[PDB]
Every structure is written in C-alpha cells, then in structure tokens.
C-alpha cells in the first residue's frame, strides 16, 4: 500500500523560507509501522531529511513532532493512527520554536524555562538522615505523575500562553517540574521557591486552555500540577 506524506523542509543555505515537500512510501499492507520507521525510511531515499530521534521507544523525548496538526512522538505514533483515505500525512516541527533545519527545532527557550524554576533538590542540611532521606510511600506517591516527564516539549509547544511569552511564562512542562520539587518532602526550600513564582507571568499566564494534557505522550497532567502551584501561591501570599 502507498503512503503519502507532506513534510516541512527548511535549510537556511538553500531555502528563502520554509516549504512542504511531498513523499511517497510503499508499505507492507499486513503490517503497521510507527511514524519514525517511515521517517528513517524516507531518509534512505532522501538523505537530506533531518529530524531528531534516539531511543525509538517513547522514553528519551527526542522526536516530538506536529503530526496532522497535533503534537506527539514519532516513535510511538503508529502510521495507522495518521492515515486517512485520500489525505497526506502532514509532519511539521513543534510549533512556536525557532526552526534550525527541517523538523529540528531550537529547544533553548524550553530548557531556559526549566532552569528558571531551579529543578534540583534544595536541602538545607539540617537534621541529616543516617543514610538515605526517609520518604514514606505516601510522600513518595506525591511525585508520581511528575518525575516521569521526558522533556519532549510536546505540551509547552502546544500552549498559546507559551507562544506569546516563552521567556516569561514558565510553560506547562517547566511548571510540572517546579511542582515536582515543591512537593518533594526532601526539598526544604518550598517557601523560597514560591516567592520566585509570584509575579504576573511565571505561573499565572496559564489560564486552563488545557492543550498540555491531551498531547503529553506520557499521560501526565500539567494543568493539575499548575493548579496545585496556584493553591500554594494563594495559601502563602493571600
């Protein structure tokens, strides 16, 4: 069976602006591949096609793409979920970020927002434990749904608030991370972290658009994490 693609191309030493290019791929009928399988095959026939990938199992977060208008990872998006009689499969870079080449975006501003919220254990050293910090299962469960984030940027690049202020709004992924440290029992800087999240932009630009949740390949929920941050902010500053 024939597969048809419309893929985003852009190379600054050749192209004046971006363009969509058509691609065909004979597929085995009785077997269903992932979009990444297709991409890798397209590259055999057009070696100039650049895209990121690595683990090919939805864990490393390399290959976030906008597929038929919706973000996800190529490596776990089956062709059968994208294919429509008489339409092309449309593949474009994650929205809102500068495009380096073809389907490769500059994630710098995404990583910058992550660093802004200080994503590392902050522990004041008082009352050191004999061995590991003791964390009861109940306290540990609070991290579930937060630490699994693969920093793929599917969520933030699908958030309008992030598009309009990528340098002021932390964005869903980052705020998800901030909350991971805000509720880690082993982190003692909760108040100080909240004082850095009180301005009009960091958290409050999130207005429950809820595009974050539907695209997360790991099934995480930024909206809910953000909601919790908002409560903590009010409990402290209101």
């Amino acid at each position: 069976m024939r597969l048809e693609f419309s893929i985003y191309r852009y190379n600054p030493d050749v192209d004046d602006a971006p363009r969509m290019q058509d691609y065909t791929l004979e597929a085995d009928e009785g077997r269903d591949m992932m979009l990444l399988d297709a991409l890798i095959q397209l590259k055999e026939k057009d070696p100039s096609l650049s895209f990121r990938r690595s683990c090919r199992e939805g864990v490393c977060g390399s290959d976030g793409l906008n597929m038929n208008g919706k973000n996800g990872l190529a490596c776990i998006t089956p062709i059968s979920a994208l294919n429509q009689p008489g339409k092309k499969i449309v593949i474009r870079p994650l929205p809102g970020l500068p495009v380096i080449r073809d389907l490769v975006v500059d994630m710098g501003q995404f990583y910058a927002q992550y660093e802004k919220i200080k994503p590392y254990l902050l522990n004041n050293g008082q009352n050191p434990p004999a061995r590991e910090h003791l964390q009861m299962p109940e306290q540990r469960e609070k991290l579930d749904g937060l630490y699994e984030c693969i920093l793929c940027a599917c969520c933030s690049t699908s958030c309008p608030s992030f598009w309009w202020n990528p340098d002021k709004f932390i964005g869903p992924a980052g705020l998800l991370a901030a909350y991971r440290f805000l509720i880690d029992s082993r982190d003692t800087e909760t108040d100080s972290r909240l004082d850095g999240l009180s301005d009009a932009f960091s958290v409050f630009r999130c207005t429950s658009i809820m595009n974050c949740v539907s695209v997360c390949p790991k099934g995480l929920n930024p909206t809910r994490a953000i909601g919790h941050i908002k409560s903590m902010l009010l409990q402290r500053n209101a």
Partner: protein
C-alpha cells in the same frame, strides 16, 4: 504581583455575577416596560448603589483582563502604553459617567 491580580479579577467577577442576576431578575419579571416603572427601579437606593459597585468592579476586572490580552499581543512598548492609557481612561470614564447618570435620577 500576580496573586493579587488572580484574586481581584475573581472577587470582582463574583460581585458582577451577582449584579447580573439582579438586573436579569428585574428584566425577566416586569412585562410592560413603561418609562415610570423603569425610572422607579433606577431611583431605588438599592439599584443605585449596586450599579455603582458594579462599575467599580468592571473598572478593576476589565483593567486586569485587558492588561492580560495586551501583554500577549502588543509587544512594542510605546504602542502598548498608549493603548493602556486609552483603556484605563475609558474605564474611569465609565464609572464617572455612571455616577452622573444615576445621581441625576
């Protein structure tokens, strides 16, 4: 700060929701709208106060809200401050014009 906005915008939204329930109540339960029953409603101390309160609430709530919109879509600083000026003055005008319309009844 943003916690301040978050709260004021919501406090005023609660007040305004009450005012709308009040004005809808009236409009939905009077039938024949003569000039006299109209002027009678707006002569009432209750209606005068509630209405002025609503205008203050709109001043605060819409100022916050319009600010949010502008700071998303209007990047150049000069054009933005000007639009804020217009909008703030308009809202203040609203409240003042509201005072003059009702104290005159």
């Amino acid at each position: 700060n943003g916690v301040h906005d978050f709260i004021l915008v919501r406090a005023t939204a609660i007040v305004l929701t009450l005012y709308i329930i009040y004005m809808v109540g009236f409009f939905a339960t009077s039938g024949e709208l003569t000039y006299e029953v109209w002027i009678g409603f707006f002569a009432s101390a209750f209606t005068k106060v509630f209405t002025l309160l609503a205008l203050f609430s709109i001043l605060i709530h819409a100022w916050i809200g319009m600010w949010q919109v502008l700071t998303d879509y209007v990047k150049p600083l000069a054009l933005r401050l000007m639009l804020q000026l217009v909008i703030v003055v308009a809202l203040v005008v609203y409240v003042i014009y509201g005072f003059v319309v009702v104290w005159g009844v």
